[PDB]
Design an enzyme around this catalytic site. Structure first.
Site, short mmCIF file in Angstrom:
data_model
loop_
_atom_site.label_atom_id
_atom_site.label_comp_id
_atom_site.label_asym_id
_atom_site.label_seq_id
_atom_site.Cartn_x
_atom_site.Cartn_y
_atom_site.Cartn_z
N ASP A 137 0.87 -1.19 0.00
CA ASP A 137 0.00 0.00 0.00
C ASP A 137 0.89 1.23 0.00
O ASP A 137 1.45 1.57 1.04
CB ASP A 137 -0.94 -0.03 1.21
N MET A 138 1.07 1.84 -1.16
CA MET A 138 1.99 2.97 -1.27
C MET A 138 1.33 4.13 -2.02
O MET A 138 1.86 5.24 -2.03
CB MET A 138 3.25 2.51 -2.00
N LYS A 139 0.17 3.89 -2.66
CA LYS A 139 -0.61 4.96 -3.30
C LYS A 139 0.23 5.76 -4.29
O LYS A 139 0.20 7.01 -4.33
CB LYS A 139 -1.26 5.86 -2.24
N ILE A 140 0.97 5.01 -5.10
CA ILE A 140 1.98 5.64 -5.94
C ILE A 140 1.29 6.44 -7.04
O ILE A 140 0.18 6.13 -7.51
CB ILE A 140 2.96 4.64 -6.58
N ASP B 148 -2.43 9.78 2.12
CA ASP B 148 -3.02 8.66 2.87
C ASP B 148 -3.97 9.23 3.91
O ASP B 148 -4.18 10.43 3.96
CB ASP B 148 -1.94 7.77 3.54
#
Ligand SMILES: Nc1cc(=O)[nH]c(=O)n1[C@@H]1O[C@H](COP(=O)(O)O)[C@@H](O)[C@H]1O
Ligand SMILES: Nc1cc(=O)[nH]c(=O)n1[C@@H]1O[C@H](COP(=O)(O)O)[C@@H](O)[C@H]1O
Lengths: 322, 328
Positions: A137-140, B148
């Site tokens: 999970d890095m939301k690149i 996030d």
């Protein structure tokens, strides 16, 4: 190389769950583990040392195999590395029999500099040995030339099965994340669709195009791109992150994209409703509705039993839906 | 009235550097595997003349990670520190670019993606790069497009602003504006930080969400810009000498004009000149501000892939300054 679509189906057949365990250790989790181990004569580290695949991790294995009392007096610089890595091994050993997938959020592994990235690599090595499907999970998000560095990190260096991606910049970034033209390789991703933060409506719901809300536009464009890349033909996919407090959107997404893969965080620490989430996102192939639980397991002092309860409750709910 | 390096807010550090060197050039430091290999090859072929120059710079003694290795003689590294060779040449490449070009830079922007693909080793390099820039007192941006939930993003805040001691970072606020409270503010320490949010990007399909999505005839990029500034006001950033600014691509001339027209005093970071072929004259015209630290022009590969990066940087510095002079 099975492909992540196949890895998920096969593990689902073996363990009959859709629980995704989140491994997001924070500084207090690591400190607490060290303190407890130092007080309980290192019971959990001693257990970790008896597991077979600890012998296969790639970074500083001979440090990780040393006895804790010797780390403290002879390898003191490595103390934090050792206890951080052993906390992760401990959670994995205690809970992996209940997990369809593990999801590691990159943010928790970077804030100490290089040391947590060594831990992260060892965690991916350990899960790979255990044949457990993984998500980073890095939301690149970046331009094509830049994001190929993330492809290399995630899919070549860590050997992750999948990752999370923020496609707000555009949906061509996926060509340089989910596909490697030179090597003819294909990888899977979950794109952000509806998130769990309290103000998530501000762009995801309140923006629109031709009276479809932004989250639907983004979901559809992601699937358009999956088809372009021919991922599903190569046993890979682009799926959706849909928060486990977003019942209307979960219901909408599962109805209008019947066979999509969904990753749903937000139950436990963020108070999402497990029964409603799993029911609104339900699919017979329930690897298509991954229920992520992080802190409600990792911040539970009895993490095996915490994971077992979620596994048992998911399985009860799956039975009701079947 | 004097303050040591590190003891002033970004707004003031930028203004002070802009008054010193009179440009808005932002040098991008995005070394790729080819760059590192080519630096190693060239140094090996020329008896390491650039590495030996890096080694005489005072502030190399002030970086945090593996100084014992970085300060070794290069032939020593190759023959008896084989496992450290890549770290050493990667770090020295970065030091070399900074040494050759910093006199022309209003800021340096490091894109995190280039420092992670080898695992931990590039993060040691990145930490030393930020320590070195801190010692030189040159404004920094970590380009990482972080996003996030609040609890998770505090970890990026710690990495970027405590560990690297960056002045600023890039942020993708599609998840929401709330995350800025946990990026640009630390409630435990009562510290404020600066960020550039993504507004209009340079990728060819950037219009697909940034322009196509709308609320009542305002396009997404405009609504995202306004919400970011609403958050900046709420957090009192500019009163504490920090800011939330905007990333607006060099190739996005109409959006640049809209943004500068409707938010006259905003801070803009504009990548896309050089390798991506954006029009510098149009970008600077359309984004101009008399405080031109408010229109940063990022140039990465067109400097760092040139065999003479000092001269490439000088040429862009002079080109930018000639366009700024037309505007003044
Ligand atoms: N990727 C996410 C999208 C999202 O909308 N919400 C969310 O919590 N996450 C991540 O999922 C995990 C939630 O973990 P927990 O709340 O179960 O601890 C964390 O890694 C979050 O950063
Ligand atoms: N952050 C960005 C937003 C953007 O829209 N375009 C862009 O190029 N970037 C970044 O700027 C730099 C462009 O560098 P170059 O094209 O001058 O080498 C790279 O770090 C890109 O990832």
């Amino acid at each position: 190389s099975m492909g992540f679509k196949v890895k998920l189906e096969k593990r689902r057949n073996a363990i009959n769950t859709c629980l995704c365990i989140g491994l997001d250790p924070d500084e207090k989790d690591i400190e607490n583990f060290m303190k407890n181990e130092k007080e309980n004569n290192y019971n959990n580290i001693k257990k970790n040392l008896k597991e077979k695949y600890i012998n296969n991790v790639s970074i500083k294995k001979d440090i990780l195999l040393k006895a804790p009392d010797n780390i403290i007096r002879e390898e003191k610089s490595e103390e934090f590395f050792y206890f951080f890595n052993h906390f992760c091994f401990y959670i994995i050993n205690e809970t992996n029999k209940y997990a369809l997938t593990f999801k590691m959020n990159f943010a928790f592994y970077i804030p100490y500099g290089s040391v947590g990235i060594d831990v992260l690599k060892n965690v991916f090595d350990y899960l790979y040995e255990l044949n457990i499907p993984t998500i980073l999970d890095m939301k690149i998000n970046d331009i094509g030339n830049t994001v190929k560095n993330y492809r290399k990190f995630i899919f070549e260096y860590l050997k992750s099965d999948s990752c999370t991606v923020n496609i707000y910049m555009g949906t061509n970034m996926l060509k340089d994340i989910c596909y490697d033209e030179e090597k003819n390789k294909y990888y899977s991703a979950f794109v952000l669709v509806k998130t769990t933060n309290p103000d998530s409506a501000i762009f995801q719901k309140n923006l629109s195009l031709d009276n479809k809300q932004a989250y639907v536009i983004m979901a559809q464009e992601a699937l358009n791109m999956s088809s372009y890349l021919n991922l599903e033909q190569n046993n890979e996919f682009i799926g959706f992150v849909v928060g486990a407090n977003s019942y209307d959107e979960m219901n909408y997404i599962r109805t209008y994209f019947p066979n999509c893969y969904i990753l749903s965080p937000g139950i436990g620490a963020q108070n999402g409703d497990l029964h409603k989430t799993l029911t609104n996102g339900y699919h017979k192939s329930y690897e298509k509705i991954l229920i992520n639980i992080g802190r409600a397991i990792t911040k539970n002092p009895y993490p095996q039993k915490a994971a077992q309860m979620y596994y048992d409750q998911i399985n009860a709910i799956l039975k009701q839906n079947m």
